[PDB]
Amino acid sequence: MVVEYVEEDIGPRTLYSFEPDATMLFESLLPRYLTTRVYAALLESAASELA
Amino acid sequence: MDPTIAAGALIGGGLIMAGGAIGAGIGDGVAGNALISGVARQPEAQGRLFTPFFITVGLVEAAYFINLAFMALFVFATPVK
Ligand SMILES: COc1cc([C@](O)(CCN(C)C)[C@@H](c2cc3cc(Br)ccc3nc2OC)c2cccc(OC)c2F)cc(OC)n1
């Protein structure tokens, strides 16, 4: 995945608490993101095939 | 003679103001350390975090003031005499 730093959006924003930590959550969430992307791809392909 | 009581009030009284300052000085620290972090995590909390803070400090400062009073009672009244 390409890392693109879009904006700041939030400066004096209430900081998020991470449990246990941000890095482990991120590396455990990335494959779920990839597989939900593949799921959305399969759904779009099914709808396109029916059309 | 009587001087041995006098210093007994100056030393003891000093102790009453030693353990006093170690009490408040650190207390107000360990309490305030939980305020800053709180405010550092969400600035809009400074409004409500003063409700617990100024309670703890209150208690803490009592432990100081009493000793303060007693120190006077030791240096300006010398009870055992
Ligand atoms: C001049 O000596 C004090 C003392 C005290 C206290 O000891 C608390 C001291 N801390 C706040 C530093 C207090 C007390 C005793 C307790 C005893 C048990 Br067993 C369980 C909970 C107890 N909780 C307490 O209050 C939290 C207390 C005592 C006596 C009369 C009292 O009525 C005036 C009274 F309030 C307060 C005080 O204020 C100037 N002066």
mmCIF file of N, CA and C and ligand atoms in Angstrom:
data_model
loop_
_atom_site.group_PDB
_atom_site.id
_atom_site.type_symbol
_atom_site.label_atom_id
_atom_site.label_comp_id
_atom_site.label_asym_id
_atom_site.label_seq_id
_atom_site.Cartn_x
_atom_site.Cartn_y
_atom_site.Cartn_z
ATOM 1 N N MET A 1 0.827 -1.195 0.000
ATOM 2 C CA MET A 1 0.000 0.000 0.000
ATOM 3 C C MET A 1 0.866 1.251 0.000
ATOM 4 N N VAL A 2 0.434 2.253 -0.755
ATOM 5 C CA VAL A 2 1.129 3.534 -0.806
ATOM 6 C C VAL A 2 0.742 4.352 0.417
ATOM 7 N N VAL A 3 1.735 4.913 1.096
ATOM 8 C CA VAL A 3 1.475 5.794 2.229
ATOM 9 C C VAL A 3 1.448 7.231 1.726
ATOM 10 N N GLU A 4 0.276 7.857 1.770
ATOM 11 C CA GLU A 4 0.122 9.246 1.361
ATOM 12 C C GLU A 4 -0.363 10.061 2.552
ATOM 13 N N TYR A 5 0.385 11.109 2.889
ATOM 14 C CA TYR A 5 0.082 11.973 4.027
ATOM 15 C C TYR A 5 -0.808 13.100 3.514
ATOM 16 N N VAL A 6 -2.112 12.962 3.745
ATOM 17 C CA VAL A 6 -3.088 13.812 3.068
ATOM 18 C C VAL A 6 -3.136 15.207 3.685
ATOM 19 N N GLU A 7 -3.371 15.298 4.992
ATOM 20 C CA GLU A 7 -3.694 16.571 5.626
ATOM 21 C C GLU A 7 -3.212 16.533 7.072
ATOM 22 N N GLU A 8 -3.649 17.519 7.854
ATOM 23 C CA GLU A 8 -3.665 17.436 9.309
ATOM 24 C C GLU A 8 -5.058 17.143 9.844
ATOM 25 N N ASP A 9 -6.059 17.860 9.321
ATOM 26 C CA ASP A 9 -7.470 17.601 9.716
ATOM 27 C C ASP A 9 -7.679 17.981 11.184
ATOM 28 N N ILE A 10 -6.998 17.291 12.103
ATOM 29 C CA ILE A 10 -7.221 17.543 13.558
ATOM 30 C C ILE A 10 -5.904 17.972 14.213
ATOM 31 N N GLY A 11 -5.900 19.129 14.883
ATOM 32 C CA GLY A 11 -4.696 19.589 15.606
ATOM 33 C C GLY A 11 -4.894 19.442 17.103
ATOM 34 N N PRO A 12 -5.717 20.292 17.758
ATOM 35 C CA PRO A 12 -6.022 20.122 19.178
ATOM 36 C C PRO A 12 -7.127 19.069 19.305
ATOM 37 N N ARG A 13 -6.874 17.859 18.797
ATOM 38 C CA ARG A 13 -7.909 16.792 18.802
ATOM 39 C C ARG A 13 -7.715 15.867 20.004
ATOM 40 N N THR A 14 -8.814 15.407 20.608
ATOM 41 C CA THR A 14 -8.720 14.461 21.709
ATOM 42 C C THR A 14 -7.992 13.207 21.246
ATOM 43 N N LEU A 15 -6.817 12.965 21.820
ATOM 44 C CA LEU A 15 -5.971 11.880 21.350
ATOM 45 C C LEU A 15 -6.616 10.529 21.630
ATOM 46 N N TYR A 16 -6.377 9.584 20.727
ATOM 47 C CA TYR A 16 -6.939 8.250 20.848
ATOM 48 C C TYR A 16 -6.101 7.408 21.797
ATOM 49 N N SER A 17 -6.765 6.583 22.595
ATOM 50 C CA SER A 17 -6.067 5.574 23.370
ATOM 51 C C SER A 17 -6.071 4.254 22.617
ATOM 52 N N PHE A 18 -4.927 3.585 22.616
ATOM 53 C CA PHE A 18 -4.770 2.335 21.892
ATOM 54 C C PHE A 18 -4.461 1.217 22.873
ATOM 55 N N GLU A 19 -5.091 0.067 22.662
ATOM 56 C CA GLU A 19 -4.971 -1.072 23.563
ATOM 57 C C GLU A 19 -4.765 -2.330 22.733
ATOM 58 N N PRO A 20 -3.601 -2.990 22.815
ATOM 59 C CA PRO A 20 -2.467 -2.647 23.678
ATOM 60 C C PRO A 20 -1.613 -1.480 23.185
ATOM 61 N N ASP A 21 -1.436 -1.340 21.876
ATOM 62 C CA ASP A 21 -0.643 -0.243 21.339
ATOM 63 C C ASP A 21 -1.009 -0.044 19.877
ATOM 64 N N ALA A 22 -0.557 1.081 19.323
ATOM 65 C CA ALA A 22 -0.947 1.441 17.966
ATOM 66 C C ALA A 22 -0.328 0.523 16.921
ATOM 67 N N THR A 23 0.930 0.121 17.104
ATOM 68 C CA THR A 23 1.619 -0.622 16.054
ATOM 69 C C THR A 23 1.061 -2.032 15.914
ATOM 70 N N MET A 24 0.822 -2.708 17.039
ATOM 71 C CA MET A 24 0.272 -4.057 16.975
ATOM 72 C C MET A 24 -1.128 -4.053 16.380
ATOM 73 N N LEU A 25 -1.970 -3.114 16.810
ATOM 74 C CA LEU A 25 -3.291 -2.972 16.208
ATOM 75 C C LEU A 25 -3.195 -2.724 14.711
ATOM 76 N N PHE A 26 -2.269 -1.863 14.287
ATOM 77 C CA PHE A 26 -2.138 -1.563 12.865
ATOM 78 C C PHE A 26 -1.742 -2.801 12.072
ATOM 79 N N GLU A 27 -0.760 -3.555 12.569
ATOM 80 C CA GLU A 27 -0.300 -4.726 11.831
ATOM 81 C C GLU A 27 -1.284 -5.881 11.935
ATOM 82 N N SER A 28 -2.218 -5.820 12.882
ATOM 83 C CA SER A 28 -3.270 -6.827 12.930
ATOM 84 C C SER A 28 -4.485 -6.418 12.114
ATOM 85 N N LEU A 29 -4.610 -5.129 11.805
ATOM 86 C CA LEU A 29 -5.761 -4.645 11.056
ATOM 87 C C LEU A 29 -5.493 -4.577 9.560
ATOM 88 N N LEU A 30 -4.238 -4.391 9.151
ATOM 89 C CA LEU A 30 -3.927 -4.289 7.724
ATOM 90 C C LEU A 30 -4.411 -5.479 6.897
ATOM 91 N N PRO A 31 -4.154 -6.737 7.272
ATOM 92 C CA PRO A 31 -4.675 -7.843 6.452
ATOM 93 C C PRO A 31 -6.192 -7.895 6.396
ATOM 94 N N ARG A 32 -6.880 -7.501 7.469
ATOM 95 C CA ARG A 32 -8.334 -7.404 7.414
ATOM 96 C C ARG A 32 -8.769 -6.355 6.399
ATOM 97 N N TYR A 33 -8.027 -5.253 6.309
ATOM 98 C CA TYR A 33 -8.329 -4.249 5.299
ATOM 99 C C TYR A 33 -8.124 -4.804 3.897
ATOM 100 N N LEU A 34 -7.032 -5.537 3.681
ATOM 101 C CA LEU A 34 -6.804 -6.118 2.362
ATOM 102 C C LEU A 34 -7.906 -7.100 1.988
ATOM 103 N N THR A 35 -8.337 -7.928 2.938
ATOM 104 C CA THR A 35 -9.350 -8.917 2.600
ATOM 105 C C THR A 35 -10.725 -8.287 2.420
ATOM 106 N N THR A 36 -11.029 -7.189 3.116
ATOM 107 C CA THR A 36 -12.302 -6.534 2.837
ATOM 108 C C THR A 36 -12.252 -5.806 1.499
ATOM 109 N N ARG A 37 -11.065 -5.352 1.083
ATOM 110 C CA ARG A 37 -10.924 -4.822 -0.269
ATOM 111 C C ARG A 37 -11.164 -5.906 -1.312
ATOM 112 N N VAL A 38 -10.607 -7.099 -1.093
ATOM 113 C CA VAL A 38 -10.831 -8.198 -2.031
ATOM 114 C C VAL A 38 -12.305 -8.592 -2.051
ATOM 115 N N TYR A 39 -12.967 -8.533 -0.897
ATOM 116 C CA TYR A 39 -14.397 -8.822 -0.841
ATOM 117 C C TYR A 39 -15.196 -7.817 -1.662
ATOM 118 N N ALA A 40 -14.899 -6.527 -1.495
ATOM 119 C CA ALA A 40 -15.577 -5.509 -2.291
ATOM 120 C C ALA A 40 -15.309 -5.705 -3.777
ATOM 121 N N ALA A 41 -14.094 -6.137 -4.123
ATOM 122 C CA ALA A 41 -13.777 -6.419 -5.518
ATOM 123 C C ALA A 41 -14.629 -7.560 -6.056
ATOM 124 N N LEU A 42 -14.754 -8.644 -5.289
ATOM 125 C CA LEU A 42 -15.580 -9.765 -5.724
ATOM 126 C C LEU A 42 -17.034 -9.349 -5.895
ATOM 127 N N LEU A 43 -17.538 -8.494 -5.005
ATOM 128 C CA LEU A 43 -18.931 -8.068 -5.115
ATOM 129 C C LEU A 43 -19.148 -7.198 -6.347
ATOM 130 N N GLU A 44 -18.233 -6.259 -6.597
ATOM 131 C CA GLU A 44 -18.352 -5.429 -7.788
ATOM 132 C C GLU A 44 -18.252 -6.272 -9.050
ATOM 133 N N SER A 45 -17.396 -7.295 -9.037
ATOM 134 C CA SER A 45 -17.271 -8.159 -10.202
ATOM 135 C C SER A 45 -18.540 -8.971 -10.426
ATOM 136 N N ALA A 46 -19.171 -9.448 -9.351
ATOM 137 C CA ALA A 46 -20.420 -10.189 -9.505
ATOM 138 C C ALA A 46 -21.518 -9.306 -10.081
ATOM 139 N N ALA A 47 -21.667 -8.091 -9.547
ATOM 140 C CA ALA A 47 -22.675 -7.180 -10.081
ATOM 141 C C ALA A 47 -22.396 -6.845 -11.541
ATOM 142 N N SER A 48 -21.125 -6.627 -11.886
ATOM 143 C CA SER A 48 -20.771 -6.322 -13.265
ATOM 144 C C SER A 48 -21.064 -7.497 -14.184
ATOM 145 N N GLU A 49 -20.798 -8.718 -13.724
ATOM 146 C CA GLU A 49 -21.080 -9.889 -14.542
ATOM 147 C C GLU A 49 -22.572 -10.043 -14.778
ATOM 148 N N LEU A 50 -23.389 -9.765 -13.764
ATOM 149 C CA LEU A 50 -24.832 -9.864 -13.967
ATOM 150 C C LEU A 50 -25.333 -8.783 -14.920
ATOM 151 N N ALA A 51 -24.773 -7.575 -14.835
ATOM 152 C CA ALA A 51 -25.142 -6.531 -15.788
ATOM 153 C C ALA A 51 -24.740 -6.909 -17.208
ATOM 154 N N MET B 1 18.625 21.974 81.802
ATOM 155 C CA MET B 1 17.499 22.661 82.490
ATOM 156 C C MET B 1 16.415 23.004 81.463
ATOM 157 N N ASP B 2 15.690 24.106 81.682
ATOM 158 C CA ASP B 2 14.648 24.516 80.744
ATOM 159 C C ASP B 2 15.109 24.575 79.287
ATOM 160 N N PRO B 3 16.340 25.012 78.985
ATOM 161 C CA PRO B 3 16.807 24.938 77.589
ATOM 162 C C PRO B 3 16.644 23.574 76.944
ATOM 163 N N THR B 4 16.842 22.487 77.695
ATOM 164 C CA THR B 4 16.688 21.155 77.118
ATOM 165 C C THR B 4 15.273 20.918 76.612
ATOM 166 N N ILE B 5 14.288 21.622 77.169
ATOM 167 C CA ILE B 5 12.938 21.560 76.621
ATOM 168 C C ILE B 5 12.824 22.466 75.406
ATOM 169 N N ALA B 6 13.450 23.643 75.468
ATOM 170 C CA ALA B 6 13.377 24.598 74.368
ATOM 171 C C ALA B 6 13.793 23.958 73.052
ATOM 172 N N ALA B 7 15.008 23.412 72.998
ATOM 173 C CA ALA B 7 15.451 22.728 71.790
ATOM 174 C C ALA B 7 14.547 21.548 71.472
ATOM 175 N N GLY B 8 14.020 20.887 72.503
ATOM 176 C CA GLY B 8 13.095 19.792 72.270
ATOM 177 C C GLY B 8 11.867 20.230 71.498
ATOM 178 N N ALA B 9 11.521 21.513 71.593
ATOM 179 C CA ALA B 9 10.440 22.045 70.775
ATOM 180 C C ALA B 9 10.948 22.472 69.406
ATOM 181 N N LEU B 10 12.174 22.995 69.344
ATOM 182 C CA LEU B 10 12.720 23.427 68.061
ATOM 183 C C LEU B 10 13.028 22.238 67.164
ATOM 184 N N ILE B 11 13.610 21.176 67.724
ATOM 185 C CA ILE B 11 13.862 19.972 66.939
ATOM 186 C C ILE B 11 12.548 19.313 66.548
ATOM 187 N N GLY B 12 11.753 18.915 67.543
ATOM 188 C CA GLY B 12 10.485 18.265 67.257
ATOM 189 C C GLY B 12 9.617 19.078 66.320
ATOM 190 N N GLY B 13 9.457 20.368 66.617
ATOM 191 C CA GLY B 13 8.735 21.243 65.712
ATOM 192 C C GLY B 13 9.265 21.190 64.296
ATOM 193 N N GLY B 14 10.588 21.240 64.136
ATOM 194 C CA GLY B 14 11.166 21.084 62.813
ATOM 195 C C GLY B 14 10.698 19.813 62.136
ATOM 196 N N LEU B 15 10.712 18.701 62.873
ATOM 197 C CA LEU B 15 10.223 17.441 62.326
ATOM 198 C C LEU B 15 8.787 17.579 61.844
ATOM 199 N N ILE B 16 7.956 18.288 62.611
ATOM 200 C CA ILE B 16 6.553 18.437 62.241
ATOM 201 C C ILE B 16 6.431 19.180 60.919
ATOM 202 N N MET B 17 7.386 20.060 60.621
ATOM 203 C CA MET B 17 7.358 20.754 59.343
ATOM 204 C C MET B 17 8.192 20.060 58.282
ATOM 205 N N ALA B 18 8.970 19.044 58.652
ATOM 206 C CA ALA B 18 9.652 18.250 57.640
ATOM 207 C C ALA B 18 8.682 17.278 56.992
ATOM 208 N N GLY B 19 8.131 16.364 57.789
ATOM 209 C CA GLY B 19 7.161 15.422 57.267
ATOM 210 C C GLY B 19 5.923 16.085 56.712
ATOM 211 N N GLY B 20 5.692 17.342 57.061
ATOM 212 C CA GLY B 20 4.630 18.096 56.437
ATOM 213 C C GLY B 20 4.941 18.379 54.986
ATOM 214 N N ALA B 21 6.134 18.913 54.715
ATOM 215 C CA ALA B 21 6.450 19.342 53.357
ATOM 216 C C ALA B 21 6.658 18.158 52.429
ATOM 217 N N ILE B 22 7.269 17.083 52.924
ATOM 218 C CA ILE B 22 7.356 15.858 52.134
ATOM 219 C C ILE B 22 5.961 15.326 51.848
ATOM 220 N N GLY B 23 5.005 15.649 52.713
ATOM 221 C CA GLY B 23 3.652 15.176 52.495
ATOM 222 C C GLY B 23 2.934 15.962 51.421
ATOM 223 N N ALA B 24 2.833 17.277 51.599
ATOM 224 C CA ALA B 24 2.184 18.110 50.595
ATOM 225 C C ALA B 24 2.999 18.157 49.312
ATOM 226 N N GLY B 25 4.289 18.471 49.426
ATOM 227 C CA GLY B 25 5.123 18.626 48.245
ATOM 228 C C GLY B 25 4.988 17.482 47.260
ATOM 229 N N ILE B 26 5.063 16.246 47.749
ATOM 230 C CA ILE B 26 4.922 15.110 46.848
ATOM 231 C C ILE B 26 3.460 14.888 46.499
ATOM 232 N N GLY B 27 2.563 15.050 47.472
ATOM 233 C CA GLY B 27 1.151 14.843 47.197
ATOM 234 C C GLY B 27 0.659 15.699 46.048
ATOM 235 N N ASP B 28 0.804 17.021 46.178
ATOM 236 C CA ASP B 28 0.416 17.934 45.108
ATOM 237 C C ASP B 28 1.107 17.590 43.799
ATOM 238 N N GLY B 29 2.286 16.976 43.863
ATOM 239 C CA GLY B 29 2.890 16.472 42.645
ATOM 240 C C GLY B 29 2.104 15.314 42.068
ATOM 241 N N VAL B 30 1.961 14.240 42.847
ATOM 242 C CA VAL B 30 1.397 13.005 42.315
ATOM 243 C C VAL B 30 -0.066 13.200 41.940
ATOM 244 N N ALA B 31 -0.729 14.184 42.547
ATOM 245 C CA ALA B 31 -2.078 14.524 42.116
ATOM 246 C C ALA B 31 -2.045 15.355 40.848
ATOM 247 N N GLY B 32 -1.194 16.380 40.813
ATOM 248 C CA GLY B 32 -1.139 17.239 39.643
ATOM 249 C C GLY B 32 -0.620 16.519 38.417
ATOM 250 N N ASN B 33 0.231 15.513 38.621
ATOM 251 C CA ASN B 33 0.705 14.706 37.505
ATOM 252 C C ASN B 33 -0.445 13.994 36.813
ATOM 253 N N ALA B 34 -1.554 13.785 37.522
ATOM 254 C CA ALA B 34 -2.700 13.144 36.891
ATOM 255 C C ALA B 34 -3.620 14.173 36.257
ATOM 256 N N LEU B 35 -3.452 15.445 36.613
ATOM 257 C CA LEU B 35 -4.204 16.498 35.944
ATOM 258 C C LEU B 35 -3.593 16.812 34.588
ATOM 259 N N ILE B 36 -2.291 17.106 34.565
ATOM 260 C CA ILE B 36 -1.614 17.459 33.321
ATOM 261 C C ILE B 36 -1.874 16.413 32.250
ATOM 262 N N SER B 37 -1.534 15.152 32.528
ATOM 263 C CA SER B 37 -1.815 14.085 31.574
ATOM 264 C C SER B 37 -3.258 14.138 31.100
ATOM 265 N N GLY B 38 -4.203 14.253 32.033
ATOM 266 C CA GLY B 38 -5.595 14.386 31.640
ATOM 267 C C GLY B 38 -5.800 15.520 30.658
ATOM 268 N N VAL B 39 -5.324 16.713 31.013
ATOM 269 C CA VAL B 39 -5.466 17.860 30.122
ATOM 270 C C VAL B 39 -4.649 17.651 28.854
ATOM 271 N N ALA B 40 -3.553 16.899 28.949
ATOM 272 C CA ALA B 40 -2.753 16.648 27.758
ATOM 273 C C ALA B 40 -3.461 15.693 26.812
ATOM 274 N N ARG B 41 -4.467 14.971 27.307
ATOM 275 C CA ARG B 41 -5.139 13.991 26.462
ATOM 276 C C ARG B 41 -6.387 14.583 25.828
ATOM 277 N N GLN B 42 -7.050 15.492 26.524
ATOM 278 C CA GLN B 42 -8.197 16.188 25.963
ATOM 279 C C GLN B 42 -8.382 17.548 26.619
ATOM 280 N N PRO B 43 -8.040 18.625 25.912
ATOM 281 C CA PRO B 43 -8.057 19.959 26.532
ATOM 282 C C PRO B 43 -9.399 20.356 27.106
ATOM 283 N N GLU B 44 -10.498 19.880 26.525
ATOM 284 C CA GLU B 44 -11.811 20.253 27.029
ATOM 285 C C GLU B 44 -12.111 19.611 28.374
ATOM 286 N N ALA B 45 -11.191 18.802 28.903
ATOM 287 C CA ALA B 45 -11.400 18.186 30.204
ATOM 288 C C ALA B 45 -10.939 19.074 31.347
ATOM 289 N N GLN B 46 -10.150 20.113 31.061
ATOM 290 C CA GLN B 46 -9.656 20.984 32.122
ATOM 291 C C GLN B 46 -10.800 21.606 32.905
ATOM 292 N N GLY B 47 -11.977 21.697 32.294
ATOM 293 C CA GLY B 47 -13.121 22.225 33.013
ATOM 294 C C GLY B 47 -13.578 21.308 34.128
ATOM 295 N N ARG B 48 -13.596 20.003 33.871
ATOM 296 C CA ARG B 48 -14.168 19.087 34.849
ATOM 297 C C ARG B 48 -13.098 18.426 35.703
ATOM 298 N N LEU B 49 -11.870 18.320 35.194
ATOM 299 C CA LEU B 49 -10.806 17.694 35.968
ATOM 300 C C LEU B 49 -10.451 18.490 37.213
ATOM 301 N N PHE B 50 -10.868 19.754 37.294
ATOM 302 C CA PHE B 50 -10.659 20.525 38.512
ATOM 303 C C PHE B 50 -11.581 20.079 39.636
ATOM 304 N N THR B 51 -12.647 19.342 39.320
ATOM 305 C CA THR B 51 -13.542 18.875 40.378
ATOM 306 C C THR B 51 -12.896 17.783 41.219
ATOM 307 N N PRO B 52 -12.247 16.765 40.644
ATOM 308 C CA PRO B 52 -11.484 15.843 41.495
ATOM 309 C C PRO B 52 -10.185 16.438 42.000
ATOM 310 N N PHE B 53 -9.439 17.136 41.139
ATOM 311 C CA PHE B 53 -8.147 17.690 41.533
ATOM 312 C C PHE B 53 -8.260 18.494 42.817
ATOM 313 N N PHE B 54 -9.056 19.561 42.798
ATOM 314 C CA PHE B 54 -9.115 20.438 43.959
ATOM 315 C C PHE B 54 -9.732 19.748 45.164
ATOM 316 N N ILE B 55 -10.226 18.522 45.002
ATOM 317 C CA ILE B 55 -10.593 17.730 46.169
ATOM 318 C C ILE B 55 -9.351 17.103 46.780
ATOM 319 N N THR B 56 -8.596 16.352 45.972
ATOM 320 C CA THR B 56 -7.401 15.690 46.483
ATOM 321 C C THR B 56 -6.468 16.689 47.141
ATOM 322 N N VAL B 57 -6.034 17.703 46.386
ATOM 323 C CA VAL B 57 -5.225 18.778 46.948
ATOM 324 C C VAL B 57 -5.798 19.242 48.271
ATOM 325 N N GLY B 58 -7.108 19.494 48.322
ATOM 326 C CA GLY B 58 -7.727 19.857 49.585
ATOM 327 C C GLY B 58 -7.304 18.934 50.709
ATOM 328 N N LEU B 59 -7.669 17.653 50.600
ATOM 329 C CA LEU B 59 -7.220 16.666 51.574
ATOM 330 C C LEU B 59 -5.730 16.802 51.836
ATOM 331 N N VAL B 60 -4.923 16.757 50.775
ATOM 332 C CA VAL B 60 -3.478 16.823 50.938
ATOM 333 C C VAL B 60 -3.093 18.060 51.728
ATOM 334 N N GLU B 61 -3.631 19.217 51.342
ATOM 335 C CA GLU B 61 -3.199 20.445 51.988
ATOM 336 C C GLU B 61 -3.598 20.466 53.448
ATOM 337 N N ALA B 62 -4.705 19.804 53.795
ATOM 338 C CA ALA B 62 -5.058 19.686 55.203
ATOM 339 C C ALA B 62 -3.923 19.047 55.981
ATOM 340 N N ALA B 63 -3.412 17.918 55.483
ATOM 341 C CA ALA B 63 -2.310 17.237 56.151
ATOM 342 C C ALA B 63 -1.144 18.181 56.385
ATOM 343 N N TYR B 64 -0.959 19.155 55.499
ATOM 344 C CA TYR B 64 0.087 20.141 55.718
ATOM 345 C C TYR B 64 -0.319 21.125 56.801
ATOM 346 N N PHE B 65 -1.479 21.768 56.632
ATOM 347 C CA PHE B 65 -1.823 22.904 57.481
ATOM 348 C C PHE B 65 -1.859 22.511 58.947
ATOM 349 N N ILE B 66 -2.500 21.383 59.258
ATOM 350 C CA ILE B 66 -2.501 20.874 60.624
ATOM 351 C C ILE B 66 -1.091 20.877 61.188
ATOM 352 N N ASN B 67 -0.160 20.214 60.494
ATOM 353 C CA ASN B 67 1.226 20.201 60.946
ATOM 354 C C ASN B 67 1.746 21.613 61.137
ATOM 355 N N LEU B 68 1.516 22.484 60.152
ATOM 356 C CA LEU B 68 1.867 23.889 60.307
ATOM 357 C C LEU B 68 1.383 24.418 61.644
ATOM 358 N N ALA B 69 0.081 24.296 61.909
ATOM 359 C CA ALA B 69 -0.463 24.721 63.191
ATOM 360 C C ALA B 69 0.322 24.110 64.339
ATOM 361 N N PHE B 70 0.477 22.785 64.326
ATOM 362 C CA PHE B 70 1.178 22.123 65.416
ATOM 363 C C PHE B 70 2.585 22.664 65.586
ATOM 364 N N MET B 71 3.270 22.981 64.485
ATOM 365 C CA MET B 71 4.611 23.532 64.616
ATOM 366 C C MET B 71 4.582 24.801 65.450
ATOM 367 N N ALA B 72 3.640 25.700 65.152
ATOM 368 C CA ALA B 72 3.460 26.872 65.997
ATOM 369 C C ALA B 72 3.204 26.462 67.439
ATOM 370 N N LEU B 73 2.282 25.517 67.647
ATOM 371 C CA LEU B 73 1.978 25.058 68.997
ATOM 372 C C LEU B 73 3.216 24.499 69.679
ATOM 373 N N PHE B 74 4.186 24.028 68.898
ATOM 374 C CA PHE B 74 5.421 23.533 69.489
ATOM 375 C C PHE B 74 6.390 24.677 69.755
ATOM 376 N N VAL B 75 6.447 25.649 68.844
ATOM 377 C CA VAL B 75 7.438 26.711 68.971
ATOM 378 C C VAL B 75 6.910 27.902 69.757
ATOM 379 N N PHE B 76 5.598 28.114 69.788
ATOM 380 C CA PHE B 76 5.037 29.270 70.467
ATOM 381 C C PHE B 76 4.166 28.925 71.664
ATOM 382 N N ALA B 77 4.037 27.648 72.022
ATOM 383 C CA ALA B 77 3.307 27.268 73.220
ATOM 384 C C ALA B 77 4.051 26.290 74.114
ATOM 385 N N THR B 78 4.926 25.439 73.563
ATOM 386 C CA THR B 78 5.723 24.469 74.308
ATOM 387 C C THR B 78 4.867 23.746 75.341
ATOM 388 N N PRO B 79 4.000 22.826 74.911
ATOM 389 C CA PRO B 79 2.997 22.272 75.839
ATOM 390 C C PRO B 79 3.590 21.610 77.068
ATOM 391 N N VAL B 80 4.486 20.644 76.892
ATOM 392 C CA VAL B 80 5.045 19.903 78.016
ATOM 393 C C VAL B 80 6.034 20.840 78.700
ATOM 394 N N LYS B 81 5.599 21.465 79.787
ATOM 395 C CA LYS B 81 6.426 22.449 80.465
ATOM 396 C C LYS B 81 5.928 22.688 81.885
HETATM 397 C C1 LIG C 1 -7.253 19.273 63.737
HETATM 398 O O1 LIG C 1 -7.253 17.913 63.356
HETATM 399 C C2 LIG C 1 -7.959 17.660 62.159
HETATM 400 C C3 LIG C 1 -8.170 16.331 61.755
HETATM 401 C C4 LIG C 1 -8.868 16.103 60.567
HETATM 402 C C5 LIG C 1 -9.120 14.637 60.096
HETATM 403 O O2 LIG C 1 -8.435 13.782 60.915
HETATM 404 C C6 LIG C 1 -8.619 14.446 58.639
HETATM 405 C C7 LIG C 1 -7.158 14.948 58.370
HETATM 406 N N1 LIG C 1 -6.887 14.904 56.914
HETATM 407 C C8 LIG C 1 -7.904 15.673 56.191
HETATM 408 C C9 LIG C 1 -5.577 15.475 56.638
HETATM 409 C C10 LIG C 1 -10.641 14.347 60.129
HETATM 410 C C11 LIG C 1 -10.932 12.871 59.809
HETATM 411 C C12 LIG C 1 -10.722 11.855 60.730
HETATM 412 C C13 LIG C 1 -11.015 10.502 60.348
HETATM 413 C C14 LIG C 1 -10.815 9.437 61.263
HETATM 414 C C15 LIG C 1 -11.102 8.124 60.882
HETATM 415 BR BR1 LIG C 1 -10.827 6.672 62.141
HETATM 416 C C16 LIG C 1 -11.586 7.866 59.595
HETATM 417 C C17 LIG C 1 -11.782 8.910 58.699
HETATM 418 C C18 LIG C 1 -11.487 10.252 59.091
HETATM 419 N N2 LIG C 1 -11.682 11.265 58.206
HETATM 420 C C19 LIG C 1 -11.425 12.523 58.526
HETATM 421 O O3 LIG C 1 -11.638 13.529 57.585
HETATM 422 C C20 LIG C 1 -11.314 13.159 56.261
HETATM 423 C C21 LIG C 1 -11.262 14.828 61.458
HETATM 424 C C22 LIG C 1 -10.800 14.390 62.700
HETATM 425 C C23 LIG C 1 -11.389 14.858 63.880
HETATM 426 C C24 LIG C 1 -12.438 15.774 63.818
HETATM 427 C C25 LIG C 1 -12.897 16.216 62.583
HETATM 428 O O4 LIG C 1 -13.955 17.146 62.517
HETATM 429 C C26 LIG C 1 -13.516 18.478 62.361
HETATM 430 C C27 LIG C 1 -12.309 15.749 61.405
HETATM 431 F F1 LIG C 1 -12.762 16.188 60.206
HETATM 432 C C28 LIG C 1 -9.336 17.193 59.824
HETATM 433 C C29 LIG C 1 -9.072 18.485 60.311
HETATM 434 O O5 LIG C 1 -9.522 19.603 59.591
HETATM 435 C C30 LIG C 1 -8.863 20.796 59.938
HETATM 436 N N3 LIG C 1 -8.404 18.680 61.442
#
